[PDB]
Amino acid sequence: SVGIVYGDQYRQLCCSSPKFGDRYALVMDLINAYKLIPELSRVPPLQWDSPSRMYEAVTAFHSTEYVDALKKLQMLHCEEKELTADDELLMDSFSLNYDCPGFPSVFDYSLAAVQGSLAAASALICRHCEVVINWGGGWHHAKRSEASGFCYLNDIVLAIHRLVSSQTRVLYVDLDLHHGDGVEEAFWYSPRVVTFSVHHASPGFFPGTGTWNMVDNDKLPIFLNGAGRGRFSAFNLPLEEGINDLDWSNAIGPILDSLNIVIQPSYVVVQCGADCLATDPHRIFRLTNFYPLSGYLYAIKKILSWKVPTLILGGGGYNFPDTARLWTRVTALTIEEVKGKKMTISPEIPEHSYFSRYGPDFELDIDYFPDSIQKHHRRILEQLRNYADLNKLIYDYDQVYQLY
Ligand SMILES: [K+]
Ligand SMILES: [K+]
Ligand SMILES: [Zn+2]
């Protein structure tokens, strides 16, 4: 069965932030408008028996000082008076400012994503669901003691921790426009959680990592890829702007297949940030949600074909209607692949709460008309072999080679 995280309180909290506003409501309501909810298993967000238990859970990754500061940020933003100079300095020291501002619900909002992704992980662990979706989660940039890119708590890292602690190996796949730095860092030293991010990278583009390592020497630059026992276990594919569905699919396809073959993961966690869409305000990549093929749908279908318990998460995407259009198709596709039953989504957006937001055409398709990679493939193939050799993994080097 395919599970999805939702709930009345969950929805309210996920819609309480200034940056993402009511995005989660549009997503879930569009899924509902397409009559998909009865096909899905409702997974309630996790709750804790006490403040201490909650704190224990979140500090499994985050520092106590950082969690304390994030809690204080909420309290301060629920008061009339301005922050003191000392409190400003404190918040700045955790990057709780700039693109990670405070707001009255900042702690509750951030924690909600954690509640949802932990619950999703548990439903996979006890085998209640074969796949679980959490469109309220996917906050890949949050660090141990730093907020980053409107990510305050890293629900992904905490969920993966739960999965690995349930030998267990986890494959993390980050499809967002931006490098999955927080998750990559969290597992930099662990061979058990392999991370793979495909993203745009270019000078001055956030967050700046996931590409060639810039250092003071004249040698050709190279990629960092993990450390200690985690050497070779962090994979990255930076792509130039403008890439379309087909080229993006061909770029990541062989990599995904080779990773599954070599790693043989017990769980897959996929971050499906929707900011690669051609209609995203970034205007960097040109992916679509087309399903006659959308790069996103191509990747998800491939991952699902592995029949490995899978967690599907959200992430970036500041065009709310088109993010909803994409995730609705991802959800329908997941039902179809898992349950082996056909879904017939009307090409026309059905009347519902937010119908008006889908102008002007009101169709399910987004309103859009559509050497380096070979070098990356060779590099990645070499890294995969290196990872396998270091971890004494069994597999056919030629079969994997033939994938590319
Ligand atoms: K990414
Ligand atoms: K790793
Ligand atoms: Zn992003």
Author numbering: 2 to 167, 177 to 302, 316 to 393, 402 to 435
Excerpt from the paper describing this PDB structure:
In our study, we show that Schistosoma mansoni histone deacetylase 8 (smHDAC8) is a functional acetyl-L-lysine deacetylase that plays an important role in parasite infectivity and is therefore a relevant target for drug discovery. The smHDAC8 adopts a fold similar to hHDAC8 (r.m.s.d. on Cα's of 1.2 Å between the human and schistosome enzymes), forming a single α/β domain composed of a central, eight-stranded parallel β-sheet sandwiched by 15 α-helices (α1–α15). In smHDAC8 these three ions and their coordinating residues are conserved, thus reinforcing the similarity between the human and schistosome HDAC8 enzymes. Therefore, the flipped-out conformation of smHDAC8 F151 appears to be highly specific to the schistosome enzyme in contrast to human HDACs, suggesting that this feature, together with the specific replacement of human M274 by schistosome H292, could provide the basis for the design of specific inhibitors targeting smHDAC8.
Crystals were obtained that belonged to space group P1 and which diffracted to 1.8 Å resolution. The final model contains four independent non-crystallographic monomers (r.m.s.d. on Cα's from 0.1 to 0.6 Å), and has good deviations from ideal geometry, with R-factor and R-free values of 0.15 and 0.19. We were able to crystallize smHDAC8 in a non-inhibited form. However, we observed in our electronic density the unambiguous presence of an L-tartrate molecule provided by the crystallization buffer which was bound in the smHDAC8 active site where it coordinated the catalytic zinc ion. Our structural data suggest that HDAC8 enzymes display some flexibility at their active sites, which could explain that small molecules (e.g. L-tartrate in our native form and inhibitors in the other cases) coordinating the catalytic zinc are required to stabilize the protein and support crystallization. First, as expected, we observe the replacement of M274 by H292 in smHDAC8 that diminishes the hydrophobic character of the pocket that normally accommodates the aliphatic part of the incoming acetylated lysine. Further, while the position of smHDAC8 D100 is similar to that of its human counterpart, D101, we observe a change in conformation of the smHDAC8 Y341 side chain compared to hHDAC8 Y306. In contrast, the smHDAC8 Y341 side chain points towards the rim of the catalytic pocket. The most striking and certainly least expected difference concerns the smHDAC8 F151 side chain that is turned away from the catalytic pocket and is inserted into a smaller hydrophobic pocket formed by loops that surround the active site. In the schistosome HDAC8 enzymes, this leucine is replaced by a serine (S18). This smaller residue enlarges the pocket accommodating the F151 side chain, enabling it to adopt its observed flipped-out conformation.
